[PDB]
């Protein structure tokens, strides 16, 4: 048949403003056809790792649920967004499971997200009592109690605000420039699968 009603990957990838990594957006994708080969053929993506598939298996295998998680990080912790890594974003902001079956897509966004006075709107969580579970989200702004003394909500010598701002100025070096990262999760449940690759007529 003809191919129409594709998945809105252009809604996710080409968005005007992405979310920060402490409050990453998660979008459920279902009941549509997705062209991953179009994403691979685009040379603009500086980082494209897939951890349980190849783009050929992306085209040839149908899936039930596709979750697109989007956030902005720096270039240095792009390698942190991976299964089994240990690091500040991976511990306190966005944890991937060890048996992850999906793709991690990252590209530089210095020409959109950076501004000359500093884009302080992109936050990240610096301190947390415990590490996150895989795909956990925590938008709480609880004051981190690093010592035995109670915080009672106020700032102190051992009570710190857990969120810190990225600078994101255009004169930053590579590794400090903002990188928009989209993470796709593929999994199979006990449900009728509906998302699958395009068909050559």
């Amino acid at each position: 048949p003809n191919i129409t009603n594709l998945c809105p990957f252009g809604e996710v990838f080409n968005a005007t403003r992405f979310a920060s990594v402490y409050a990453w957006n998660r979008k459920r994708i279902s009941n549509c056809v997705a062209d991953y080969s179009v994403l691979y053929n685009s040379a603009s993506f500086s980082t494209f790792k897939c951890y349980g598939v190849s783009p050929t298996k992306l085209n040839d295998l149908c899936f039930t649920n596709v979750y697109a998680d989007s956030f902005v990080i720096r270039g240095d912790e792009v390698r942190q967004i991976a299964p089994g890594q240990t690091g500040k974003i991976a511990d306190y902001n966005y944890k991937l499971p060890d048996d992850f079956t999906g793709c991690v897509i990252a590209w530089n966004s210095n020409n959109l997200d950076s501004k000359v006075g500093g884009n302080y709107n992109y936050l990240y969580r610096l301190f947390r009592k415990s590490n996150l579970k895989p795909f956990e989200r925590d938008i709480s702004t609880e004051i981190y109690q690093a010592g035995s003394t109670p915080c009672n909500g106020v700032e102190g010598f051992n009570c710190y605000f857990p969120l810190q701002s990225y600078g994101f100025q255009p004169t930053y070096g590579v590794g400090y420039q903002p990188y928009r990262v989209v993470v796709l999760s593929f999994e199979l449940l006990h449900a009728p699968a509906t998302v699958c690759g395009p068909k050559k007529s």
């Binding site: 610096l126 301190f127 981190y144 690093a146 010592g147 035995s148 010598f157 051992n158 710190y160 810190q164 701002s165 600078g167 100025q169 004169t171 930053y172 070096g173 590579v174 590794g175 400090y176």
Partner: protein
Amino acid sequence: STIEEQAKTFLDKFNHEAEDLFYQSSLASWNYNTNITEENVQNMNNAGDKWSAFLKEQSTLAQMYPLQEIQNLTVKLQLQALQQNGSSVLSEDKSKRLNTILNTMSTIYSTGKVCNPDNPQECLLLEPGLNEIMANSLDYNERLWAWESWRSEVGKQLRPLYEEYVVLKNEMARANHYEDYGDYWRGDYEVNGVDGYDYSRGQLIEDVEHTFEEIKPLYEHLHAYVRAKLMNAYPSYISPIGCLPAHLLGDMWGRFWTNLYSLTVPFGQKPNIDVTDAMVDQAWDAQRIFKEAEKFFVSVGLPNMTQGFWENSMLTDPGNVQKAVCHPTAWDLGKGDFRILMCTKVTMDDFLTAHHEMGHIQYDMAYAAQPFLLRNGANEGFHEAVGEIMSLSAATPKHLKSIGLLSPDFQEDNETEINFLLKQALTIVGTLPFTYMLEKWRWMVFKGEIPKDQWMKKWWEMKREIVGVVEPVPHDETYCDPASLFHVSNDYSFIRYYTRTLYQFQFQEALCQAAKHEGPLHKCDISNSTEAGQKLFNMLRLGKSEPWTLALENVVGAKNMNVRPLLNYFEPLFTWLKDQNKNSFVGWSTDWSPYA
């Protein structure tokens, strides 16, 4: 639960906020320096005041974490720089007076003019002025006039100011549990808490003397040869036995003897290395200069420059109205932003300066993975020595013939090496007695061994004893002659230049033994050898995370500063000078024989 986890969280918070505010301050300073505008001055003042207030607040919070419960040495190294009270230990009145004193030192030193007494019609500043007449003119009387005029004016301006400065700095150091402010300057070389590698700050004044007592015969032969050669331009003014008059040394303070090379060249008929006419005939550019420097760096195995460096550096005079400070400065703004501010001409000296500043940039990029407190040289001499390695390597005929700049059939015989080593001596071993004397005088002044009424007598006595220079006319305590230099008037430590000049030859000998160069050290090029680059990068990458003794031992195998590579570098020049001074009076006694 414990102290160390709280200290580590506090250090992480300080690292992130300090990187942000330090990037703001460094960007404001860059925008001031490449673009002289009063709005940029106000912006740079506001950024510096914000960073200073932030550093004072985090220094206040750092005292709550005691050091003696911390077992991790990196946490101790990051926290000791925060726990220093600095000038904040004084009262507000005394701190404000000290800051005002430092500012008026800066404004008095910056605003000196060279107008003739009874002829005030026209004159310039120091930089278009005193440098030209002191460097290029061969006349005795006008050099004496410029020397006496500048030193008398800045002495009468700066004499009581320096006395209040030394009193206030001694009070600030004694309040900060140091013995004196000279002892506070020696705190940069202090290493504690590492057994075997401990280096007391009182051992530095032993090691400097122990190295200088083996410098001294070479400097005596160099001084004897210079004094013998200077008779040709000044026949009656100087004596064959006594010391040199001060205003004949080709520099306003005698710090660098580089300008005396044209008067004291051994073989003027030999074609010396110039590579400037050949550079301009090949039609080079500043971009070509820095690209050839970057090609030299990747031959050793160092990583190349970022694209932001090429798009953000100012390598050429920007235009008509956009005035800038033309001094060569390498800039590490942090967060991967590295850039060079140095105006260029088609010159061999600008090529070597580009190598120097790119070496400083590579040293800054090397410790980028370190936390913010450890993003510094292991001591104050390392960061200046790493550029001098590149300056020594790029000046060799082997590197110039490799890049196609020098003629391929240029013959490197004996005379063309001796006259180059003499220029390197006038650059390097000439600054050693002046540097050691000046820092010894400052250490004795800050210690309190010299009263007010004996400053100039002891200074000129140690100049005659160590440097072998007599004053042209007698001077008294109404002047303050050493304070005429930039570094002493602007509260800079000056012992960095001695340690730079020994660490550069220790590093050069280590890398040339790593690069398997079988020839002499002065002809050695450390280019094209990855095995030298890895040894270099292993100490470049440490930053302040390791003691400077351990980082030194990583490359040269010795955990103390050593002087033998400097001696064996100048070994053919030393043998030629020993065979030259067969009949001249080698060395000197302290004397007033040329001028009483």
